[PDB]
Amino acid sequence: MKLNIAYPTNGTQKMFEIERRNEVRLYDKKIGDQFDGGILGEEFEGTIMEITGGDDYQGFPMVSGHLTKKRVRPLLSKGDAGYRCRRKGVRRRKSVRGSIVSEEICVLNLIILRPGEKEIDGLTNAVNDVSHLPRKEKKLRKMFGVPDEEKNVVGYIRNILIPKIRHNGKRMKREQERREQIMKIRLERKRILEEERKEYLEKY
Amino acid sequence: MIQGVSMFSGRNIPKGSGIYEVMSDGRAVLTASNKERRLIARKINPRDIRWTTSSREFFGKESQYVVEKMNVQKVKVVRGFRHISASSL
RNA sequence: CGCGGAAGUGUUUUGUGCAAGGGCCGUAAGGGAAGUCGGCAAGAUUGAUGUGUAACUUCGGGAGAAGGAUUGGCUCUAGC
RNA sequence: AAAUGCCUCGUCAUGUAAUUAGUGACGCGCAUGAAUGGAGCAACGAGAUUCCCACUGUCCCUACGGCCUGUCUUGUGAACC
RNA sequence: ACGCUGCUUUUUGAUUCUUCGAUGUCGGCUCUUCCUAUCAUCGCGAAGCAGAGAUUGCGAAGUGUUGGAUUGUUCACCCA
RNA sequence: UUGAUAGUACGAGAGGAACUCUUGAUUGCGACCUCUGGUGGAGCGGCGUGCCUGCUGGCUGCUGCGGAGCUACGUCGGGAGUAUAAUGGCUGAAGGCCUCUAAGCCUGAAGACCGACUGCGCGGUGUGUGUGGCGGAAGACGACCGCUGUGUGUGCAAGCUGUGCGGAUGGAGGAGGAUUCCGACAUUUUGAGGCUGUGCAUU
RNA sequence: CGGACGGCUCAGUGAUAGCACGAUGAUUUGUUUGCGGGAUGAGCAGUAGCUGCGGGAAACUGCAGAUAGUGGUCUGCCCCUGUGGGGGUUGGCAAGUAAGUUGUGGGCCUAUCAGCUGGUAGUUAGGGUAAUGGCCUAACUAGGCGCAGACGGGAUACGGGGGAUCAGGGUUUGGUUCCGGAGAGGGAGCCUGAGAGAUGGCUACUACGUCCAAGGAUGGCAGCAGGCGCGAAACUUGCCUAA
């Protein structure tokens, strides 16, 4: 079974491969059951790996919450592994597998939790790029440490160096105005009301 | 070599010792002996028989699926994005 | 009555441990009268209490027709 | 074509994969027939027949088990021919 | 074709030699063995034998030749 | 009997084979118990009727599972030896030709004989037997196979049944001052108790 | 936000539907109108698109990385109480529009259809509902309908607005433009939503099926054209950013 290993700390993946002598040691292990990497081959020694998923020979995925080695067919809804929902309120019966490894799984998905003293080529060397930069202003301030009243938070960072910086600048200003005149109207409604109470209470 | 697992008692069956029974829906259940096919015919629930494994984990004598496997692992190295490779904050 | 107990009454203390074939019995996969002159023999139904009961008929019967259901132990309630 | 029809396993229909059996219909009936009683079946029958459901070692095809005999000992000790 | 010559002992007759001071008289079921005048299987001829399918002849008796409906039937007649 | 040979030879067409190789079975015969099924008055459990004053524990009845052994509905196992029959051929006269035949020779059958396989008598040879007792893989009784004190008992291993008595904490409800008594059954101590003719060790 | 309307059809239904006059003081209502109402606090979790590694004949789908909206929990706010406490997280009022529930009355034919009915008629309590009610359950009473036709059975039964015939009085007909109902091969059960027991939504059984590498995956013309079938019996696979 070809393995699909990933190192989250460096953010990198690559497709590995093993033979059916060490393959038989993986059987009867749950999703989230993980072990020492030396069992698989040689270069994986001294590592701590982890199991997270896998497919079978027909494409169907393994999901948690079933605890069987056979193929089931439940009724799944929006937010469920095994279904990709498009209409609102719709549910589908669709086949999946259980959370236990056996001779049916075609590909395993793993996780390098602690590297070893050796050097796996495409995983322990590179350090890949992040993809997005934060947009919330509290989170932006804690990334670079701009606590000086922050005075203009984007312009502060543009000088510290070209990288373009997007941010929720406009969205803070719309809502800032919306709940400022809403206080303006609460005064008019109340003020214009008590004039009529007294003027009404005058005559009668 | 194992033939399969008993669908009533939960125990491993040696190669050449069970009988598969296919039902009308296409479901093939595997049993070990006539001690077990009789309990299915009478409609007894396996959790009321103390030598089965579904009865030992119902009463908490011993769970049949150990999980955790000691899983003591943490690391959070930081990386760069496109040109800010050396942030130095 | 059957299935078990009293009372009264009767009774011995150095043969073997069990081949084949008999006499009287018990249990059997899957099939279900293909057996035989012939369902011979065996198997099957069976007590009680609700339910539900056809053709025909000398109007009395047929009738317990057929067919379906319930049943232990324990702790209480209601009637006279 | 009946417990009564020789010819005869009569002819037609129906039940079966297959019907010298059973039932229905036909009638020149060797030799049916009216207290020699004729026609007729409600109720009753350890009476004679054919089929259906149920059920099974009747059978396919036999196996294993129980008790008493037989096999072995002592005593008593015949008969048929 | 019209005529003519044989063999067997499975038919039914013909006869009355044995048995009437008793040889248990039909069929089926069960089990063994023998014959060849061979149905199939093995070898080989002929043809009005193209091939296929059959028909006719010779050597050959080692091995096989079933399950049912109706009848007591032998026999018969149908189904697979 | 399956596949190949082969939609080939043969035939205007329609149709449609064989030698050699290869796959499975039906039935007969002779064995065997690893597996599966049957039996199992051995063993353990459940539910009852009567009796021992009741509980515990017994005996008696019906029922579930059921090891060893036995068994079939289960598993295993078949000569290319020699000479011939019918027929077809070689050489060859009688009969200057002809002819498988008169002398000779070649080939050829689920048949014959032989081999292999089982039983019995008789022979030979550097060759002659444990009285009794106790066991079994052997057995109606005789016999046969073994030893010549290595049994019995117990422990462990390997199995069958299925969670023991007593205690503690609960229980549909009922009874009534004590915060007591009656109650089928439940959970826990507890894959627990009971049992074994098989194997190993020891005494 | 919408796809619950619009469009098609007449199987079921003889009155539980439809028409006429009533009750809702027994009920809910997005969009529309006019008034009211509104957390810029803390502290943690964490996702679509996007950037990479991939599975499968297909139809469809997984894992890692990093981010808006967002989701918990405290804090405050509001509600029922108070000489204790306990809940909720901003949801309103009135019109208009729509919808649900309910009372009485009407010439299809038939007595070779005369007696029918067990949740059946009522009382008392509770549950459920947006809401009354045997609608449902527990206990108890013995009722309810009928020649002024009950209860049954039949024929080509969707109801009206309407059509035909024609001195008057009558007889016959309405699948079909408008309004009301019911259904999407046959039965059932449901999710989302102000509104559906929805079928150009989902799940199961059932009639007929279709595609596959054989392990799986899938269908719904009584919408507009069109094809087959059936029968005596019925049009174009056209053009449209205009009304």
Side-chain angles (χ1 to χ4, degrees):
Chain A
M1 50 168 69
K2 39 180 71 165
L3 306 172
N4 190 12
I5 313 168
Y7 189 19
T9 286
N10 278 358
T12 180
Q13 301 220 22
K14 81 180 306 286
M15 190 78 80
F16 276 105
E17 177 47 288
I18 68 169
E19 46 85 23
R20 297 194 183 267
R21 171 185 54 269
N22 311 113
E23 170 178 356
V24 302
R25 306 170 183 172
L26 275 62
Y27 295 172
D28 286 308
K29 318 192 75 150
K30 292 176 67 177
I31 288 185
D33 282 356
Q34 63 281 14
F35 49 90
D36 287 326
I39 278 177
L40 317 178
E42 199 54 16
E43 57 278 40
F44 298 115
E45 293 186 345
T47 43
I48 309 298
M49 314 206 71
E50 189 160 357
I51 284 184
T52 52
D55 297 271
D56 66 358
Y57 276 108
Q58 282 77 228
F60 300 106
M62 301 215 307
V63 302
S64 321
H66 287 315
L67 284 172
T68 185
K69 269 158 75 167
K70 321 210 192 188
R71 221 198 279 168
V72 289
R73 269 165 70 71
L75 199 74
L76 304 165
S77 203
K78 172 83 160 320
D80 262 351
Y83 184 38
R84 184 69 185 257
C85 175
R86 294 309 179 227
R87 201 166 167 158
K88 188 171 155 198
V90 176
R91 330 191 271 180
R92 297 292 308 259
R93 193 167 303 278
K94 295 178 88 70
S95 48
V96 305
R97 297 206 75 100
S99 310
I100 288 183
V101 184
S102 70
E103 306 91 317
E104 310 294 353
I105 292 82
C106 189
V107 180
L108 260 182
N109 302 336
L110 291 155
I111 278 283
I112 285 282
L113 271 181
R114 194 189 64 201
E117 69 281 27
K118 306 202 284 198
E119 198 67 17
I120 311 97
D121 191 276
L123 307 196
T124 309
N125 295 320
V127 180
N128 285 335
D129 308 315
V130 189
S131 190
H132 304 281
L133 207 53
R135 293 170 68 112
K136 291 287 88 179
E137 215 180 299
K138 275 180 175 311
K139 274 169 53 187
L140 279 169
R141 195 169 296 114
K142 197 176 56 57
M143 195 177 187
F144 305 88
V146 191
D148 312 331
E149 313 167 13
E150 163 263 332
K151 46 102 185 174
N152 165 23
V153 78
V154 175
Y156 183 93
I157 301 182
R158 294 182 186 273
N159 301 341
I160 295 168
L161 290 185
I162 316 170
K164 54 90 184 179
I165 278 183
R166 322 175 153 282
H167 66 115
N168 282 348
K170 277 165 308 297
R171 185 180 197 101
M172 272 301 114
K173 201 175 48 53
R174 296 194 207 92
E175 331 299 343
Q176 181 87 7
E177 311 176 328
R178 291 182 206 161
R179 66 173 70 189
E180 273 189 356
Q181 57 95 8
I182 286 187
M183 294 308 309
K184 277 173 55 180
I185 297 178
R186 279 192 204 174
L187 311 198
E188 318 310 322
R189 295 181 173 176
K190 194 201 58 192
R191 168 204 298 95
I192 305 308
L193 172 54
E194 293 104 14
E195 318 292 314
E196 318 189 38
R197 284 188 210 140
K198 50 164 73 178
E199 197 271 339
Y200 168 82
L201 278 185
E202 289 184 3
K203 321 180 177 194
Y204 308 104
Chain B
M1 286 200 176
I2 298 300
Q3 181 100 51
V5 165
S6 192
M7 296 202 38
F8 189 85
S9 57
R11 299 162 153 201
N12 279 5
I13 296 175
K15 194 46 175 324
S17 307
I19 294 166
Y20 289 95
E21 185 179 15
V22 187
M23 307 281 144
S24 179
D25 51 11
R27 202 189 60 263
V29 53
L30 170 70
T31 56
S33 56
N34 177 242
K35 165 150 99 164
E36 274 185 31
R37 293 181 220 114
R38 278 309 287 253
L39 293 172
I40 292 160
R42 301 211 287 137
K43 288 175 68 187
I44 315 288
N45 205 280
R47 282 167 200 74
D48 269 297
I49 294 95
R50 300 323 180 83
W51 53 266
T52 82
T53 80
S54 79
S55 179
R56 300 207 99 224
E57 45 174 332
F58 181 83
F59 290 104
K61 294 309 170 86
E62 203 73 80
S63 193
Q64 282 307 328
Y65 279 163
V66 174
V67 51
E68 202 277 332
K69 292 181 184 295
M70 164 273 290
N71 295 345
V72 282
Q73 295 295 118
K74 299 293 181 291
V75 67
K76 191 63 179 175
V77 180
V78 172
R79 54 187 183 170
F81 162 66
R82 183 166 288 178
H83 301 131
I84 194 66
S85 298
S87 294
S88 298
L89 276 299

